[PDB]
Amino acid sequence: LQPLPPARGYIYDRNGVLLADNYPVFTATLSKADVENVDTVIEQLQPILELTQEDVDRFKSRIKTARKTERVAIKLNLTETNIAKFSEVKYKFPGVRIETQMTRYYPHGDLFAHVIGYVGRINDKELKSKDLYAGTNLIGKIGVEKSYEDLLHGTPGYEKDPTRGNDLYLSLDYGLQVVASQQLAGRRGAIVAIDPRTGEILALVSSPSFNPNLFVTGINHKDYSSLRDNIDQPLYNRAVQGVYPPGSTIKPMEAMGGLHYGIVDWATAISDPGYFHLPGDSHKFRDWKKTGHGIVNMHKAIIMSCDTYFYILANQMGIDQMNQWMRQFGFGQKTGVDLPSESEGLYPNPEWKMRTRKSKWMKGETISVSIGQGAFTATPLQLAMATAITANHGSHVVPHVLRATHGAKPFTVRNAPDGKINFNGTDEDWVKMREAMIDVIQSGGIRTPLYQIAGKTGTAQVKERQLDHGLFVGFAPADKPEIAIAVIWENGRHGGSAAQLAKPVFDYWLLTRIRP
Amino acid sequence: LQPLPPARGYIYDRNGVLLADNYPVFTATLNVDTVIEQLQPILELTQEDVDRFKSRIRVAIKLNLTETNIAKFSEVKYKFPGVRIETQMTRYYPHGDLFAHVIGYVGRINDKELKSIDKDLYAGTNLIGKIGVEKSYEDLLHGTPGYEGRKDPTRGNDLYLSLDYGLQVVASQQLAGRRGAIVAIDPRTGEILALVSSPSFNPNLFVTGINHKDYSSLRDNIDQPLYNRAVQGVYPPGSTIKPMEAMGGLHYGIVDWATAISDPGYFHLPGDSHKFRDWKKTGHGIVNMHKAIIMSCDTYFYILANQMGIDQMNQWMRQFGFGQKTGVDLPSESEGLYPNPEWKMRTRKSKWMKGETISVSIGQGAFTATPLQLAMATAITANHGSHVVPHVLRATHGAKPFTVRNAPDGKINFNGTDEDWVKMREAMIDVIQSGGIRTPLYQIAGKTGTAQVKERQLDHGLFVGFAPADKPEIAIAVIWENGRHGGSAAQLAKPVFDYWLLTRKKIRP
User: Fold this and answer.
1) What per-residue string of b and e applies to A201-220 under the rule 16 or more CB within 10 Å gives b?
2) Which of these, A124, A365, B369, B388, has the minimum number of CB atoms within 10 Å of its CB?
3) Nearest-CA neighbor of B392 among B327, B342, B316, B454?
4) Which of A418, A421, A424, A429 to mutate to test the interface with B (most CBs of B within 10 A)?
5) With an 8 Å Cβ cutoff, is A268 touching chain B?
6) How far is B401 from chain A (nearest CA, A)?
7) Which of B327, B421, B406 is nearest to B372 (CA)?
8) What is the DSSP string of B434-473?
9) Domain boundaries, position B54
10) Residue B155, in any domain of the structure
11) Does a structural domain hold residue A195?
């Protein structure tokens, strides 16, 4: 009864464009039923196979637990020198076998590293959790490979045919991923593209990327330290882990809450003296334009990104109601994406402050939040979802990466919005807010003559590396949206700059539609 | 800066039928030991009402004061200065027994255990949601306070349940005097159209605090009117489970609609003497899938399970809602148990035996399901595999923002044709014609089952089904505790099907 381990499944894009693979290598096995006492044997072949002190520790861990009949890998994917140095002594080690196995390959490694992740060597912590993983050398460690490890893994067999792991079709588009990646080539930040009708992530780039293949068989302490100590942090996933102050990208949604709670009209106007002062308080809270913007109804506020209009709206609305509603767009909470280490962001409230800083909430801390400042931070993923919901007229979607799986194992794949934001407004309001956001593009310059983009821009302050971040959220075609994009250019200065990154993505998806 | 507490929101059915409201009452707010003896004849305080008030120790002496004790206290107002007379709201359930197990009740907020976890939000708030909808949606229902310059409080949100008053009445009658549950889901959305656990009880006894006499009636009643058989009760689902489990055969490629077996009336594990027994000792002869469903052969599913394996058996059945909470927006939802080697190793430290698989193969193992799970599994089956989440809330109206899910969760990838679902429907219609629930006006699909207990020793009868079969609008799970054979249970389901599908465009209160 020898275990026959199962083929890890392939991962494709939404088009069959192959993104993760299995190809054969030479690996040195060593079953317990073929050797008298392992610990000695390993010591002899350490210099001949160039085993590191980690490679022996790892091999011993499996052997102790492993069945007699199951072969345990001593060194994986042998280099041609390990092959040569062992073949000379091939017969002086009889129990040791050296035959063909599979490792994982990422044909387009940098491109999808931050969505697909990689597989690692299965280790100590993982070993304390079956007989499922008998012939299995590798486990998913981050990304899709982790979050969908069980679907991908397969089902073992014996000497009974093993059941091959499930194929995964991501909702990502090879082409759209390429375009967005180029947009952030040489630059730090993120670009997320969601289909608003579904919540499908059409493209997700955090930049710089890294090569996942370096991790599959174990990575050099030399190579790993270069990535971990790069100052641009290629290993950090800015789309699902990175968090940023959203700035005025939030104003369209926060305006919709004004309509929802009845605090404002589309015709409601304020006199904008260039500041807002809390009642019975002298500290002036300053518009970005210190002279002001004159009389400002909702539509001028969005077009011109007035802070003063939203200082007042927040003041009347209050942080509690401000929390309750903005959260409906995805803020302050994980989005639910089927990817491992997703960040919560922070939409601040007195409950968070009482535990974090044991101080009562100050009415002025609200004012900072209303313009996307203060403690308010969102992941690029969250910002894109908020823009998808705003594009789709309030239908709450879940950002997800998986489109279909094919295989023996049963699985349920989410492909429609879960529910609709109760909203005491017309549908017309969503349509008016779109038209406002079309004007953000027209009235201020990444215009296209082929379709209409709705969008809003923002700028965040850093916690050269000190330059403000540029943010841009938007969707197109505006009337009947198909894709919403959040871009965060780190140290990108003006937000409109970030819009420039977003246009080629839009253009590719809506107009332009393989090998490296 | 005195707080102004917020009006709790109203709860309706899906048609505006009012199911819970608040009405204004007079209550006497407030050493206390001397005054109460003087204030007892005036306010008609019982020895229980005084005990509560001393234990409770502004604190209420008596709630909902009659006009007379208000008049009789007004002449003596001066001998009691601290005693004040204020307005409060209490909660009323126009149809208490009918919707008790869906709406629950509000209790007194007295629970310091709950009165320490929350905020100054409940400032001036006397009532809190205790079980059911009132608990699960306490925050939506609660509202937002105000003060004294005065600030109007924001009232709680009105709730529209996906439940239908008429359909609830019909279903409730079916179990009048009987124990069990009936759940009706819309398979297109997962909306719960009806949910009755029987016996019921009157929730209004809880709003103001419940008497040890009244509470002891309910807690020590043998029928357990306080137990929610729909969302907490679990039963062995038995042969109701077969349509889904057969669909898993198709998905794993193990069987065809044409694949047939010889049923000698038993199944023999290879190299093993213990015979596994068909319900019909004669057998059923040659049995393809379609015969299997109509005649509820245990043998056909004994074989399929063995080939499928418990692990593969788990992956598939869990897609229908079994072994895990369904997600209903009601408080205490029970998981059920779809057993697996993981559960046995952790629970009883024993390796899984191939025969334990066989018990589960016909829904008679450690397998237990809630009527919720059964309704959901049948909804998905009617629905060709789109995973729905059973939910009770249809809309809310109010100031607080809320998101309401009212569409299917996702779609089971299924390595079959769409037609397999259509072939399985036709099988389940054939269950109705061939084996007295049939109607010529629409097509019912169904399957029957029987569970064994531990009159009240009679086996339970189960029935799952949906209609109209070709374009399903409603799926029902029925469980008569001690209803003998399922089929009795099916009888409870036909009036419900009929009210929804026929009568309901001609039952108001």
Assistant:
1) bbbbbbbbbbebbbbbbbbe
2) A124
3) B327
4) A418
5) no
6) 6
7) B327
8) H-----SSS--EEEEEEE----TTSPEEEEEEEESSSS--
9) 31-82
10) no
11) yes
